[PDB]
Design a protein around this ligand. Structure first.
Ligand SMILES: C[C@@H](C1CC1)N1Cc2cc(-c3ccn4nc(N)c(-c5cnn(C)c5)c4n3)cc(C(F)(F)F)c2C1=O
Length: 828
């Protein structure tokens, strides 16, 4: 009771929003969701293994790729066991477990000892072979020794959870639905009218506009908008979308007609409306505008066996199922899908198109859809198609049972795969009608089960709460629900992290107020010293990479980055002892820009890598951690031994072909290291040429493109033209110019086609991730989404796609420096 208020105030600090507050509400759905999420939390906390939770072994049941088998010498992975300034190497095979390795060590000079990684809080533990650990695969990929420290396991009592102290709609009639629009109000384009839509999954079932009156401070209509749809006909999660036009949309607000308790909405509502800045995720929100003083408001009143198909039609049905998600279904396609629904149900890929064809505004039709969803032996037995699963969780589907079967397929995901899709799955909670949902419980459950997922779950939820008024109320209830079962050790760790972000965001606002200058470098090193002496914690877990513990600031190494945005080049000491080297943990702390759009671009690029792993292609674009920490701010990994090619080129806008290759000659001393860097350049450049072409972000200036000393190319910014950057300086490194060819350029083409075709095998997955980004990330249009189809070349064989992408390579070679030079013209 007394201490619970302090614990509640502790949660509010971590969450960044007061869940107990009821200023911006008209119902108890948020409070019901807090109470509702008690059951899945305590079940998941009870079911989880205490030992494996504390140690959190990051593993994958996927196969090891062909390129990583060639890194293994003679079926023998070298693993070095360290123990208080004494190291010993062991001959261990890929199929051996940690338990087998422990027995092998303890033979040559027992139960209460575990193999922790050197430097990181990462544990080689549990009934899993040594190749399946993701740290072991990272060491073999990058070409580094697997250094391991022998020590006692962490205590599960540190992860203790506290004691927590806590179908048909009623008034069913055959009458038509109506709403009285009383009027509107605002304190601070000379005509307006209210448009009352009845939406269900971005689909207007009925629409009734008011009469056009003049745009004054208080416009009062006082009129029943009588619709032609019954009360029984209203489906669950039906959305009363109220909008104010003037041709020109000004304001909007939504209201759920059927509530969380299966009851129809009634009584007086003065809903405070969101202002506009086409369709997006913010358009769908049940939350009202919290800023009640300035915002627009709207006052309302609510008061109340089977035969075989023909061969033509089966071919016609299979033709409809074969098309992509963005291919629009006609009225003829929907009627065919519905009439032959039991044949459509035998194909899993039909499901998005089938449940799009449902007439959700008829109660009898929804009942048949539920009867159809009952017997789904094919869907349950099918292999996990994540792209197909992601379709059913987008804006087009509002039914709980349709969305629940998608979430059911997500249950079979391993923890490694959940991390790849976690950001997008957290963004997919915006498309839910209700606060409590199957997806919300899935994210909670898998967050509570694994520490790594739960770490990134915290930051994805906390970032949205900060920079989105539309969905902060939903995410705070989910985040509170995670934090109430994550454990005391993690609660302590998240507090230490938030304190570092809070202090650094306080420091960074003052620096931007005060181009490079003498005072700016001194004032930063002043402020970083002041916090470090007392207030700043002794250590903290790195948000983008929770294995690393960053300690105290190396304030001599700290600086402000010389740009317009002025990000903070911070540099921390490694807190955990027994590290390999004495290299500092470098962190760029970004501020000012909205990172939400760019965070989702990055996560797709990480999904593109995992596609290229499954078909044996080692491109490895994007070699740095990056994460959004709050409102307009973020935290990014520094790559040691790396610079921008604009710095390399000029060492006014005069470019050079030879200079980039001479830079690689300088930094890599030997010819084997040089040819490795030329090879790594060919693989990475081919990855970026393919990836940016698909996403439509290839035309770019060279100041935001970087290259490591090891040859690995990477990008630090995302958006008479070129489809991607393949300039003469890049082509020179391969060994060609103008109208010539070479072994590396031929290899670049072979890698480009293989990588491009590899992405085409997951066309539907990439389409929906691209579609979900533009709605959830950006505060868009159908035509913006339709580019990726043309970029992927949908409905064309591998020879035509090869010919298509090879032509786009030749476009870059003809123009060359024209696009890069045009930045200097357009600069002036
Ligand atoms: C897309 C967005 C994302 C939403 C945040 N991103 C990603 C990103 C990466 C890096 C980066 C990452 C590793 N390294 N390693 C380095 N050595 C550098 C280095 C040395 N000098 N410069 C000039 C760079 C670096 N920069 C820097 C930036 C910056 F522009 F904010 F500063 C952003 C940035 O805004």
């Amino acid at each position: 009771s007394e201490e619970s208020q302090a614990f509640q105030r502790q949660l509010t600090a971590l969450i960044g929003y007061d869940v107990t507050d009821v200023s911006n509400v008209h119902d108890d759905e948020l409070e019901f969701t807090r109470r509702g999420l008690v059951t899945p939390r305590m079940a998941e906390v009870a079911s989880r293994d205490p030992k494996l939770y504390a140690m959190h072994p990051w593993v994958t049941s996927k196969p090891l790729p062909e390129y990583l088998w060639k890194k293994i010498a003679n079926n023998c992975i070298f693993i070095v066991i360290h123990r208080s300034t004494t190291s010993q190497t062991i001959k261990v095979s890929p199929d051996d477990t940690p338990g087998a390795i422990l027995q092998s060590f303890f033979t040559k000079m027992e139960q209460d000892f575990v193999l922790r990684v050197c430097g990181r809080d990462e544990y080689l533990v549990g009934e899993t072979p040594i190749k399946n650990f993701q740290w072991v695969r990272h060491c073999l990929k990058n070409g580094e020794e697997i250094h391991v420290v022998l020590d006692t396991p962490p205590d599960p009592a540190l992860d203790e959870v506290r004691k927590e102290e806590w179908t048909v709609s009623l008034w069913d009639c055959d009458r038509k639905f109506r709403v009285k629009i009383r009027g509107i109000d605002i304190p601070v384009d000379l005509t307006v009218f209210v448009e009352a839509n009845i939406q269900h999954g971005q689909q207007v079932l009925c629409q009734r506009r008011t009469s056009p009156k003049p745009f004054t401070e208080e416009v009062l209509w006082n009129v029943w908008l009588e619709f032609s749809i019954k009360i029984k006909d209203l489906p669950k999660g039906a959305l009363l979308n109220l909008q104010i036009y003037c041709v020109q949309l000004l304001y909007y607000v939504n209201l759920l007609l059927i509530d969380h308790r299966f009851l129809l909405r009634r009584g007086e509502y003065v809903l405070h409306m969101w202002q506009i800045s086409s369709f997006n995720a913010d358009k769908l929100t049940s939350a009202t505008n919290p800023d009640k003083e300035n915002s627009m408001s709207i006052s309302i009143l609510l008061d109340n066996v089977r035969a075989e198909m023909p061969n033509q039609l089966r071919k016609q049905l299979e033709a409809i199922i074969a098309t992509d998600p963005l291919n629009p279904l006609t009225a003829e396609d929907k009627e065919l899908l519905w009439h032959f629904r039991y044949e459509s149900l035998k194909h899993p890929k039909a499901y998005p198109k089938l449940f799009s064809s449902v007439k959700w505004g008829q109660q009898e039709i929804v009942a048949k859809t539920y009867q159809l969803l009952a017997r789904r032996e094919v869907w349950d037995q099918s292999a996990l198609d994540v792209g197909l699963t992601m379709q059913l969780l987008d804006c087009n589907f509002s039914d709980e049972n349709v969305r629940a079967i998608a979430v059911q397929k997500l249950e079979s995901l391993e923890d490694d795969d959940v991390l790849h899709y976690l950001l997008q799955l957290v963004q997919a909670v915006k498309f839910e009608p209700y606060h409590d949902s199957a997806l919300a419980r899935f994210l909670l459950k898998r967050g509570l089960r694994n520490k790594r997922i739960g770490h990134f779950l915290f930051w994805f939820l906390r970032s949205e709460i900060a920079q989105s008024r539309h969905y902060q109320q939903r995410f705070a209830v989910i985040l509170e629900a995670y934090l109430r079962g994550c454990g005391t050790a993690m609660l302590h760790d998240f507090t230490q992290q938030v304190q570092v972000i809070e202090m650094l965001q306080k420091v960074t606002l003052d620096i931007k107020s005060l181009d490079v200058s003498s005072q700016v470098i001194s004032q930063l090193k002043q402020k970083l010293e002041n916090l470090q002496n007392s207030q700043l914690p002794e250590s903290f877990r790195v948000p983008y990479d929770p294995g690393l513990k960053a300690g105290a600031l190396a304030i001599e190494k700290c600086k402000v980055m010389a740009s317009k945005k002025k990000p903070l080049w911070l540099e921390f000491k490694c807190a955990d002892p027994t590290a390999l080297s004495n290299e500092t943990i470098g962190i760029i702390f970004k501020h000012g820009d909205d990172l939400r759009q760019d965070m989702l671009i990055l996560q797709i690029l990480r999904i593109m890598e995992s596609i290229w792993e499954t078909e044996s292609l080692d491109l490895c674009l994007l070699p740095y951690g990056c994460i959004s920490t709050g409102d307009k701010i973020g935290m990014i990994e520094i790559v040691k031994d790396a610079t921008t090619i604009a710095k390399i080129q000029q060492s006014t806008g005069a470019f050079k072909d030879e200079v980039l290759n001479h830079w690689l000659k300088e930094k890599s001393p030997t010819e084997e290291k040089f040819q490795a860097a030329v090879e790594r350049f060919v693989y990475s450049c081919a990855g970026y040429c393919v990836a940016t072409f698909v996403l439509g972000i290839g035309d770019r200036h060279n100041d935001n493109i970087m290259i490591t000393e090891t040859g690995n190319l990477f990008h630090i910014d995302f958006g008479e033209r070129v489809p991607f950057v393949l300039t003469p300086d890049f082509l020179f490194v391969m060994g060609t110019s103008g109208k010539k060819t070479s072994p590396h350029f031929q290899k670049f083409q072979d890698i480009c086609v293989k990588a491009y075709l590899a992405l085409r095998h997951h066309t539907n997955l990439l389409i929906i991730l691209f579609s979900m980004m533009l709605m959830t990330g950006m505060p868009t249009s159908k035509e913006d989404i339709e580019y990726i189809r043309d970029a992927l070349t949908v409905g064309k064989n591998e020879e035509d796609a090869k010919k298509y992408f090879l032509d786009q390579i030749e476009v870059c070679r003809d123009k060359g420096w024209t696009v890069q030079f045009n930045w200097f013209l357009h600069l002036v």
